[PDB]
């Protein structure tokens, strides 16, 4: 189950 | 026993050769089960193992939505990276990410990971406590400050403890005959002489799953640490490995190859004979 990756460096 | 789920993603800029390219793969243990590739026509998450193929359409819609979101995020992080490292827009760069979790034999959470690399080097990583970050250089110190100011470790912790472990357990049941299987190595030895006074004994292991294994050579008990090759995929879901040693002619009987693997009831002690 993929993770929500929303945070920019 | 213990198990793990990992998602690996690679972002590559290629100015003048293509739009930035994003590839993600999901693994359970040594067994790949999904991929998404930006340059491909589907533009969605695809099954790469038979046992995930019966997830319903809403699963694939949900997973495609998330990995496409990741694709956009990591392509902006390439741009940000140019600013942090004060690099020019003509170069090609690589941004890699890994996240996932381990469970023990009882299905309980053991470990979670959420890390990034830039140009083949550590960038930032979620610490074991799932509450703080390890920044590998001054650029990541910026990201670290941002992520602390956003309190984002909380979202990682909720995913790793909840969503990730829940999925791993579901897959272990879905692919039980394949994920919780245990294929023992088929073993043999080759012999080739190098010179008039030396010869090569190679101990072979083929057809085994999982990929973890120990090949060791002992000459009269003491391990003569030898040539080891990296464990390689056969392409069918099993792996292969060999270990070779150079031996004085007339001494092949003193040398024994030792094989340790979870598929073996008892470790194997192989001795060459013509």
């Amino acid at each position: 189950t993929y993770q929500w990756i929303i945070r920019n460096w | 026993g213990s198990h793990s789920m990992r998602y690996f993603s690679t972002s590559v800029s290629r100015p003048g050769r293509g739009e930035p390219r994003f590839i993600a793969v999901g693994y359970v243990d040594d067994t790949q089960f999904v991929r998404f590739d930006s340059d491909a026509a589907s533009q969605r998450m695809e099954p790469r193992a038979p046992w995930i193929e019966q997830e319903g359409p809403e699963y694939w819609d949900e997973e495609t939505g998330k990995v496409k979101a990741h694709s956009q995020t990591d392509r902006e992080n390439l741009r940000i990276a140019l600013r942090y490292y004060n690099q020019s827009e003509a170069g090609s760069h690589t941004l890699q990410m890994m996240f996932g979790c381990d469970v023990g034999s009882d299905g309980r959470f053991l470990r979670g990971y959420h890390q990034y690399a830039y140009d083949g080097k550590d960038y930032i990583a979620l610490k074991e406590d799932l509450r703080s970050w390890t920044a590998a250089d001054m650029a990541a110190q910026i990201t670290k400050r941002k992520w602390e100011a956003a309190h984002v470790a909380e979202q990682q912790r909720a995913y790793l403890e909840g969503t990730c472990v829940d999925g791993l357990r579901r897959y272990l049941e879905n692919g039980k005959e394949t994920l919780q299987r245990t294929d023992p190595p088929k073993t043999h030895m080759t012999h080739h002489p190098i010179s008039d006074h030396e010869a090569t004994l190679r101990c072979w292991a083929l057809g085994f799953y999982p990929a973890e294994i120990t090949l060791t050579w002992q000459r009269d008990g003491e391990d003569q640490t030898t040539e080891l090759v990296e464990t390689r995929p056969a392409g069918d879901g099993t792996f292969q490995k060999w270990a070779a040693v150079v031996v004085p002619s007339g001494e092949e009987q003193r040398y024994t190859c030792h094989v340790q693997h979870e598929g073996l009831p008892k470790p194997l002690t192989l001795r060459w004979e013509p």
Binding site: - | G16, Q72, I142, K146, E148, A149, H151
Partner: protein, 266 residues
């Protein structure tokens, strides 16, 4: 399929410069004269259009030499838009240029000049400009570009352009730029005044390590100082009004924290 790209940008002022590069494995250029090589069949090898004129405006594909065949299939489409051919439109942000993360904003482009098409371009993005048909009302032509849901990728400096009916790729001079800023989700800082709000200096402090603070009245910019007690502060010297301030980090000038709580100077 060859990959065609323009460098540094496909949106280029008249008199500027743009290079068409065609990456394959010598190449020829085409314009949407689909089978007619441009420049009477020139083999570009190393296309540096310079200075760019309005004749360079167009929708381009390339093919590269392929001896074991003798050319490749056509490349991807790159639309070169030449700017600076009409008076500039106006760009307006509704409700405003400060956009809460995840929310939406309308960027409205309008003009007394009667433009058939409007283009919206974020500065420094290689993406194709967004295009909308100009709608006519009360002596002006206008277009509402919807931007969002807001996130870092959508923040930055925007300009909009107009074009006329028979020269759709010949754009007007750019509107004055508009900075669109995404606020959140970083933790909001605290606003205070020295000696106080009735009168002055406004202090912005926070436990988070902002490198810059931005004071906005119902903007202004200053570098934070490490100060002490582990607090990053900045002091903005000033008829009063409603003030907020936002934290910001190095190399990210268009992404700010949640706003501080409002403070009223009277």
């Amino acid at each position: 399929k060859p990959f065609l790209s323009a460098w540094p940008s496909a949106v280029v002022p008249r008199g500027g410069h743009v290079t068409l590069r065609c990456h394959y494995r010598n190449f020829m250029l085409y314009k949407e004269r689909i089978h007619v090589p441009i420049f009477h069949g020139r083999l570009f090898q190393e296309f540096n259009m310079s200075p760019v004129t309005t004749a360079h405006a167009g929708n381009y594909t390339c093919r590269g030499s392929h001896p074991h065949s003798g050319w490749s299939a056509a490349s991807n489409p790159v639309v070169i838009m030449v700017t600076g051919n009409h008076r500039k439109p106006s760009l307006l942000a509704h409700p405003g240029p400060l956009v809460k993360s995840g929310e939406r904003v309308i960027l409205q482009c309008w003009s007394d000049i009667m433009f058939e098409h409007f283009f919206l371009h974020k500065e420094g993005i290689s993406k194709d400009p967004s295009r909308l048909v100009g709608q006519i009302h009360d002596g002006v032509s206008k277009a509402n570009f919807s931007i969002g849901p807001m996130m870092f990728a959508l923040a930055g400096t925007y300009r909009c352009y107009g074009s006329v009916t028979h020269t759709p790729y010949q754009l007007s001079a750019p509107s004055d730029p508009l900075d669109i800023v995404v606020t959140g989700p970083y933790e909001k800082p605290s606003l205070s005044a020295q000696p106080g709000p009735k009168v002055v200096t406004l202090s912005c402090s926070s436990r988070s390590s902002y490198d810059m603070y931005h004071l906005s009245r119902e903007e202004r910019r200053l570098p934070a100082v490490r100060k002490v007690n582990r607090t990053f502060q900045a002091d903005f010297p000033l008829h009063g009004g409603t003030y907020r301030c936002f934290g910001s980090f190095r190399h990210s000038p268009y992404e700010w924290s949640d706003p501080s709580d409002p403070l009223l100077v009277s």
